[PDB]
């Protein structure tokens, strides 16, 4: 069956983001006026939170754990689909084709993504999706 879906984590293997982890939010399997190929809208995190430890108190923890996200159209061929998953229903509205085209709507739509990700990093659900891939 089709393992590219709304929750499926992937890895970005092609360009400026190569090595970073994403989540496939709104896949278009076949067709579009532009992008005449199967592509998937994704959201991912560009900066990974730094090592946090017992010894860091006070303000370091909040400034180590800062996440920087992104939203991108990407071609399947540039993704490694993997078995992991996220619960994506938070921002399903906020990451969309309508968000692109009006780039103001893209920096409005990182906030609802940046907030959903720093939540999950508390309450350590999806421990792996927040750890820097290494290569």
């Amino acid at each position: 069956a089709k393992f590219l879906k709304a929750g499926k984590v992937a890895v970005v293997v092609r360009g400026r983001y190569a090595g970073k982890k994403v989540v496939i939010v709104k896949p278009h399997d076949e067709g579009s006026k532009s992008h005449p190929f199967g592509h998937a809208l994704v959201a991912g995190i560009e900066r990974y939170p730094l090592k946090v430890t017992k010894k860091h108190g006070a303000k370091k923890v909040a400034k180590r754990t800062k996440i920087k996200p992104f939203i991108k159209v990407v071609n399947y061929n540039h993704l490694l689909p993997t078995r992991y998953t996220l619960d994506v229903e938070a921002f399903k509205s906020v990451v969309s084709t309508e968000t692109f085209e009006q780039p103001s709507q893209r920096e409005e739509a990182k906030k609802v993504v940046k907030k959903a990700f720093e939540e999950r990093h508390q309450a350590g659900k999806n421990q792996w999706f927040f750890s820097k891939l290494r290569f």
């Binding site: 890895v11 400026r16 090595g19 490694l80 993997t82 891939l133 290494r134 290569f135």
Partner: peptide
Amino acid sequence: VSRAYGGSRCANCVKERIIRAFLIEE
């Protein structure tokens, strides 16, 4: 260039070592 390993590896040598870093530690 603006990939990771920008001015160093040829971007098809970065495509592999991402594949190889994921599927070896998989």
